[PDB]
Amino acid sequence: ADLEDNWETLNDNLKVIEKADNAAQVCDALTKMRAAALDAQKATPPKLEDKSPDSPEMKDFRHGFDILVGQIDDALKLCNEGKVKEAQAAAEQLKTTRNAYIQKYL
């Protein structure tokens, strides 16, 4: 699985969360999102393949993932307390982070 696969795993699990009926279903999908985000964070996106590994752009990319992972953790805390609707709303905001931090490097 590569970065493109990781991104599409995030997309599929966002759909799972949107369609979910219970906290356990949301938790499972957030787990897969967290795993895919950890995998993606270690990749080099195509627009940064020539850039220095410590370039500001590569920092932006990796830090977008630390922010995304922290937000996934906040959503996991909600679904671990049974707060399904709150967790689903939080998952929607994960789209904003993904789009603003990461998409420009794909």
Residue numbers in the entry: 1 to 106
From the paper:
Previous studies showed that proper introduction of disulfide bonds could stabilize the flexible region of target proteins and reduce the conformational entropy by locking the protein into single desired conformation. Here we developed a comprehensive disulfide bond prediction algorithm that not just increased the success rate of predictions but also improved the quality of crystallized target proteins. We applied our method on two proteins which were previously determined to high resolution and frequently used as fusion partners for GPCR crystallization, cytochrome b562 (BRIL) and Flavodoxin, and verified our prediction by solving the crystal structures of the wild type (WT) proteins and mutants. The theoretical and experimental results both indicated that with relatively lower values of conformational entropy, proteins would be more stable and readily crystallized to higher diffraction resolution.
